[PDB]
């Protein structure tokens, strides 16, 4: 279909044409003629290579221009909201304001009312719905990207919940990978179903087994080693993406490949890569990343800060970095190699889900540069036919509502009571009746039981109250916990230990307490280091708020408190990565969450009259945020600074914002500006 053949405002067609887009893919055409332009809901299951977002953008912009109102675009992760935020920019060229909201849970962000397209994660949007933001009533369409993740245990319940509140109140468009139960999901959504595997660039999938690649079509090709697939890609002027199941694994493989890929690079490429590696922030994890980039290959996993991941992401696009070895969580190229089909799980090593293996292979074949994309699954100790039959011809897993997730369900039952007006068991059960859990007609009895037991726990801890008529009402602790977005249990742990906190409020005691609640995943420790951890604990137990571990979460929480303490004590990131065996990306993630939990602890204190420690906690909140000593807090409002600069400034001079408001710029570059002078 032709962009002009579409029945939508010229302002959409203009934007498209400017994007290079002149014609719609067959799948896109089907979706655009299904009824979405006329407000109907839809579930779009087609290859990512086939422009799923584009269809959502067109449906969103058409909804807005033709009838006003707002459009919500739910993204799976914070970082994916920034990618969607950029590609949505050119919509401001026709007057549409685009906002990005992904955190700061305890606010209603009424300031979002002046926007047309709001990008958010499901949790952020779930919290906004709890605060009752006035503009929410203006959302006429909501797009759920990666809607299949609704079947993911971790956070699939949150996505299901917002989709349950919004259904029948707004147009809903879901974007998902191929799944086992398309019709089921579509029906629950009362949506038009668009299922297709049409792609712009032919994809050939195979299995590499002992020197040979066997393609689904039947042919067999010789390759001395799987890594040869990479070197072959590179010699034909293309690139490769390699997937492994463990960080250190990605790091090892990346370096190994770079050892042979380097000899495959032109002189210019070598320079850029070298300039690229020299331009990386010092620390152990970047050291490795540097060494392999100089060789033309890169690794990528959550262990790297977001800054480094982006650097890899773009330079791979720019064709400078020839290959990228990446782990699944937070990851187009001629060849996509899936090096591992087995992954270490909390359930014990298991095979990567079919659904995920298809998404990985789907990234093979850049629409312009290639006449075909190749997806290769490497089996080391696995029957080649079984791998082929399971991953290339096996129906993808069907999605299962992950609503029963006890942590999400206790936080959600409370949200209904304290922020949505549910005052009866039967009312709560009515909300559940509208979820995908209910539509799948899954375990009904066991869910009720889990809900009554939850109500009890909530009743026993004073978040809510119940009467002899069985009427439920929220108490301040209830309401306050629901608006802070914390797990009722972390509020319960905050409430139980509050007396201990006020008796002796200290970083170690605090950092350890929050690192032990359900809203934070504590750093891991090895058999080796559990040595010191043991001694230090018994050495500091006085400052903690707990009697005696006797247990694994405990010391993981304690290890985390030591990292956090080093963080606020301005210890070099490098020194922390070393002296604690932790990678930068984990530090930030943990710092980010810590700031949020210390804030929530302060707020809970406010609700329990414990106001004397509120200042202390507020102070600690900022220190955790920027990882800085108390006397560096004023200087943090500046454009940029971070613990590094801020310290250099305070010591080598300045201490206030007025102090920088009157320093010879000559005296700043003398150690540290453009942004700063720009800020003033
Ligand atoms: N009809 C089309 N014509 C040309 N390129 C397209 C078309 N649809 C998608 N694309 C390409 O696919 C890229 C992928 O993003 P997008 O289209 O939003 O799909 P997805 O949500 O699967 O990433 C776009 O930036 C563009 O390069």
Swiss-Prot record:
Residues that bind ATP: 23, 28, 46-53
GO BP annotations listed: DNA repair
One matching Pfam family: DEAD
Keyword match DNA-binding: yes
Entries under PROSITE patterns matching the protein: HELICASE_ATP_BIND_1, HELICASE_CTER
Motif (DEAH box) on chain: 145-148
GO MF term list: 3'-5' DNA helicase activity; ATP binding; ATP hydrolysis activity; DNA binding
UniProt KW keywords: ATP-binding, DNA damage, DNA repair, DNA-binding, Helicase, Hydrolase, Isomerase, Nucleotide-binding
Disulfide bond annotation, renumbered to this chain: none
Domain Helicase C-terminal: residue ranges: 229-417
Function (record text): DNA-dependent ATPase and 3'-5' DNA helicase that may be involved in repair of stalled replication forks. Unwinds the lagging strand from forked DNA structures in a 3'-5' direction. PCNA, the DNA polymerase sliding clamp subunit, stimulates the helicase activity, and may alter substrate specificity. Unwinds branched DNA (Holliday junctions) in an ATP-dependent fashion; ss- and dsDNA stimulate ATPase to the greatest extent, although it preferentially binds DNA with a single-stranded region. Processes a RecA-mediated recombination intermediate between gapped circular and homologous linear dsDNA.
The family this protein is said to belong to: Belongs to the helicase family. Hel308 subfamily.
Subunit architecture: Monomer. Interacts with PCNA.
UniProt name for this protein: ATP-dependent DNA helicase Hel308
Originating organism: Pyrococcus furiosus (strain ATCC 43587 / DSM 3638 / JCM 8422 / Vc1)
């Amino acid at each position: 279909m032709r962009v002009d053949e579409l029945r939508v405002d010229e302002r959409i067609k203009s934007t498209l044409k400017e994007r290079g887009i002149e014609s719609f893919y067959p799948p896109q055409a089907e979706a655009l003629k299904s009824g979405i332009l006329e407000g109907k809901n839809a579930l779009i299951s087609i290859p990512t290579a086939s422009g799923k977002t584009l269809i959502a953008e067109i449906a969103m912009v058409h909804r807005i221009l033709t009838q006003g109102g707002k459009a919500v675009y739910i993204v799976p992760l914070k970082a994916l909201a920034e990618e969607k935020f950029q590609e949505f920019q050119d919509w401001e060229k026709i007057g549409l304001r685009v906002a990005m909201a992904t955190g700061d849970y305890d606010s209603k962000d009424e300031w979002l009312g002046k926007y047309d397209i709001i990008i958010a994660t499901a949790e952020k949007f779930d919290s906004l719905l709890r605060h009752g933001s006035s503009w929410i009533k203006d959302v006429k369409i909501l797009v759920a990207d990666e809607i299949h993740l609704i079947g993911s245990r971790d956070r699939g319940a949150t996505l299901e919940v917002i989709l349950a509140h919004m259904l029948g109140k707004a147009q809903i468009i879901g974007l998902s990978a191929t799944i086992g139960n398309p019709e089921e999901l579509a029906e629950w959504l009362n949506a038009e179903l668009i299922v297709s595997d049409w792609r712009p660039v032919k994809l050939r999938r195979g299995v590499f087994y002992q020197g040979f690649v066997t393609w689904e079509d039947g042919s067999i090709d010789r390759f001395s080693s799987w890594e040869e697939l990479v070197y072959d890609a590179i010699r034909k002027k293309k690139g490769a993406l390699i997937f492994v199941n463990m960080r250190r694994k990605a790091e090892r493989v990346a370096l190994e490949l770079s050892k042979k890929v380097k000899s495959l690079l032109t002189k210019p490429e070598i320079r850029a890569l070298n300039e690229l590696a020299d331009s990386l922030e010092e620390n152990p994890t970047n050291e490795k990343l540097a060494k392999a980039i100089r060789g033309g290959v890169a690794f990528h996993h959550a262990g790297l800060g977001r800054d480094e991941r982006v650097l890899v992401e773009e330079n791979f696009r720019k064709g400078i970095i020839k290959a990228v070895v990446a782990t699944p969580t937070l990851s187009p190229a001629f060849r996509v190699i899936i090096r591992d089909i087995w992954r270490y799980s909390d359930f014990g090593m298991e095979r990567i889900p079919i659904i995920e293996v298809h998404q990985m292979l789907g990234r093979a074949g850049r629409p312009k540069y290639d006449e075909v994309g190749e997806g290769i699954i490497v089996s080391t100790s696995d029957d080649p036919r079984e791998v082929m039959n399971h991953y290339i011809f096996g129906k993808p897993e069907k999605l299962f509502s992950q609503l029963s997730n006890e942590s999400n369900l206790r936080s959600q039952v409370l949200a209904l009571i304290a922020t949505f007006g549910y005052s009866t068991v039967e009312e709560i059960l009515k909300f559940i009746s509208n979820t995908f859990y209910a539509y799948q007609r899954k375990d009904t009895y066991s869910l009720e039981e889990k809900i009554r037991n939850i109500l009890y726990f909530l009743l026993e801890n004073e978040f809510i109250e119940i009467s002899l008529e069985d009427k439920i009402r929220p108490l301040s602790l209830g309401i306050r916990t629901a608006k802070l977005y914390i797990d009722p249990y972390t509020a319960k742990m905050f409430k139980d230990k509050m007396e201990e906190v006020v008796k002796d409020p200290n970083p170690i005691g605090i950092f350890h307490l929050i690192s032990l609640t359900p809203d934070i995943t504590p750093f891991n420790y090895s058999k080796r280091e559990f040595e010191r951890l043991e001694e230090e604990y018994y050495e500091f137990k006085d400052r903690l708020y707990f009697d005696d571990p006797y247990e694994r979460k405990f010391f993981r929480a304690f290890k985390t408190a030591l990292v956090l303490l080093a963080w606020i004590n301005e210890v070099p990131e490098g020194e922390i990565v070393e002296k604690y065996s932790v990678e930068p990306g984990d530090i930030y993630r943990i710092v980010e969450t810590a700031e949020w939990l210390v804030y929530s602890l302060k707020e809970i204190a406010k609700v329990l009259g414990a106001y004397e420690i509120v200042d202390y906690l507020e102070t600690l909140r900022v220190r955790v945020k920027y990882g800085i000593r108390e006397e560096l807090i004023p200087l943090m409002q500046l454009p940029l600074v971070g613990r590094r600069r801020a310290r250099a400034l305070y010591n080598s001079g300045f201490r206030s914002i007025e102090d920088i408001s009157q320093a010879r710029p000559e005296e700043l570059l003398k150690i540290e500006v453009e942004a700063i002078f720009k800020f003033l």
